[PDB]
């Protein structure tokens, strides 16, 4: 997987990650993708590590949206339109070619609140 700016590859550390295939300027657009949105309880635990939520809805980002890894020192941020229909990834720092593009452990990510029960 790869487009005219990012490339997905196995991270020497964790699993897969999104890496810059070209130099990036601060505040530039990295990726905008559509999301599948359904009520929180419609999702099992399968995507618990990828879903984000707002109110009673959770969304799964398509495109490369769900591949971006979370970092304690992110060089990007994510933005969801109303209704979680669209996700946008914007850099918050310049990004050199080859650097992994990461987002923070946002509060809207299921991952920030593991659950003892689910499905």
């Amino acid at each position: 997987m790869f487009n005219d700016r990012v490339i997905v590859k196995k991270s020497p550390l964790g699993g897969y990650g999104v890496f810059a295939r070209k130099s990036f300027e601060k505040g530039e657009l990295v990726e905008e993708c559509l999301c599948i949105v359904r009520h929180n309880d419609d999702w099992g635990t399968a995507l618990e590590d990828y879903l984000f939520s707002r109110k009673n809805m959770s969304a799964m980002a398509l495109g490369f949206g769900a591949i971006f890894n979370h970092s304690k020192d992110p060089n990007a941020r994510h933005e969801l339109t109303a209704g979680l229909k669209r996700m946008r990834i914007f850099t918050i720092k310049p990004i050199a070619i080859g650097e992994e593009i990461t987002i923070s452990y946002g509060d809207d990510y299921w991952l920030s609140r593991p659950r003892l029960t689910q499905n």
Copy 2:
């Protein structure tokens, strides 16, 4: 969403679809994407219309993989590596620019067998 060959847009008929942004030859590569794979019962009903399954595993295609619509007269086919880790979409007919790229209602798609119960 769009790359150096396909573009996602609202279909005048159904919802969203993947359309050729360039002419395509028969048997050519349209898209290869990574998939998230988990046991069948780990998925709720949220993605029931997008998941495919093999044995006791189901997979959600990332990239544009889950956006391709199903047609009774498809101009493409899908292929999953072992373990459903990767999906590949190959044309089975030449495809002109602007034509929607569709796959058949494969037996491996959850959609071919709606369920009365789930999660």
